[PDB]
């Protein structure tokens, strides 16, 4: 029938957010490291300034929509519920909200990849990423692909 996507997010608070996707949030009663599936958050890994695709950026949107949001729901698909990091892979909504896609189509955060296991939301993610991409709002107004050498 497909007329139960079983797709409800669901978690219960956001303690805090790390760096974007890495967030501790407090489900069942216990503060898990989460992480944005098929997403990414900054990734401030060569010590530049902070500033070289919108990391310090990413955080402060996921930290302040979470913080701020009051109530954070986490979905788990079929990927892996912990990228080998003991975290929890999976999907942040905030207040009803997507923040992967919140922040994909606001130049925040960039489609991740994952080897198997999560690909469902994998058409409106890369649709974010895409039109963000091609209108070049943050994370993607820096990305010259310089086409040829």
Do not use: P
């Amino acid at each position: 029938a497909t007329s139960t996507k079983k797709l409800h997010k669901e978690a219960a608070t956001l303690i805090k957010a790390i760096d974007g996707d890495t967030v501790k949030l407090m489900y069942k009663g216990q503060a898990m490291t989460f992480r944005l599936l098929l997403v990414d958050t900054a990734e401030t890994k060569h010590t530049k300034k902070g500033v070289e695709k919108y990391g310090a950026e990413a955080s402060a949107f996921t930290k302040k929509m979470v913080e701020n949001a009051k109530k954070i729901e986490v979905e788990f698909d079929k990927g892996q519920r912990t990228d080998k990091y003991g975290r929890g892979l999976a999907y942040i909504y905030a207040d009803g909200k997507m923040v992967n896609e919140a922040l994909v189509r606001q130049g925040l955060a960039k489609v991740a990849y994952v080897y198997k296991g999560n690909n469902t939301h994998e058409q409106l993610l890369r649709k974010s990423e895409a039109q963000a991409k091609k209108e070049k709002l943050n994370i993607w107004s820096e990305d010259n692909a310089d086409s040829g050498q």
